[PDB]
Design a protein around this ligand. Structure first.
Ligand SMILES: [K+]
Lengths: 162, 162
């Protein structure tokens, strides 16, 4: 009868209830455990979205100090390249800020200033190799090495063909 | 003199100070911005490490209810497979808990129970195809489809050859 179709090893436990019950409990453990992962993911995002917004904003307020220091610059003078190096070397290996609003502004603000320096040193090596056309190399090689060393240390974030 | 080697557009700003200053400021913005990323990463970890520990622990306390429901089981009866399906389908697509302590226990607790069912249905199809040896197929095909449907829905986390 019902009581005997229920008795196992001296205890009244329908083995299809001790399973149907274990199921519903597993259902609840899973749901709590997932809800916990959702909470963690969602808080990560909130704090992230806000800290990136904060970073992009404080970089704007800094930009004005940078844009301003790059007009006090005598034209075709490039002791401002260490600034681009420091700033771009941080932003490019930064998941959050790479190609962000400030990064693109730092590229634009320096994109003419970089080409106006390579065109100026490529014209001073081209003239010096063309100096063998009028009648009457060690120092010249250094300027090739200088331009190559410079270009490699630029780690430019685009693909600049020309 | 010093005052004139300083005057630009009516303001006494050494253009190599308005750069050296912009540099040190960029140094500080970068450091704060990175410190902020470090904080976020580190808190993510703390909360993560603790929520995984919490999950693995509450799965232990559940295991005893599961280990217990799998001895109240009449040998070679498999309405306990929907439990493995629910639990394993969650754990396997869960970055944190996959192949964790509980996941491996759920594999072990069901690894004999799965092979003891395929060997039992592979022996009941092999006998029925071997029934064409004594003198004197539609229903038999269903059991192949049943075993294939079962095996695919198992999504076992190892590579079980045999
Ligand atoms: K977090």
């Amino acid at each position: 009868g019902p009581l005997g179709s229920m008795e196992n090893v001296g205890r009244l436990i329908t083995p299809a209830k001790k399973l149907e019950d274990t199921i519903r409990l597993a259902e609840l453990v899973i749901e709590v455990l997932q809800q916990n992962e959702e909470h963690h993911a969602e808080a990560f995002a909130w704090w992230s979205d806000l800290m990136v917004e904060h970073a992009e904003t404080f970089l704007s307020l800094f930009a004005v100090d940078m844009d301003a220091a790059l007009e006090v610059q005598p034209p075709d003078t490039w002791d401002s390249f260490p600034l681009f190096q420091l700033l771009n070397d941080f932003l490019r290996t930064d998941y959050n800020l790479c190609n962000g609003k400030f990064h693109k502004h730092l590229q634009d603000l320096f994109a003419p200033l970089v080409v106006r320096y390579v065109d100026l040193m490529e014209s001073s090596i081209a003239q010096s190799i063309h100096r063998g056309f009028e009648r009457e190399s060690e120092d010249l090689f250094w300027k090739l090495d200088a331009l190559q060393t410079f270009i490699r240390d630029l780690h430019w974030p685009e693909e600049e063909f020309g």
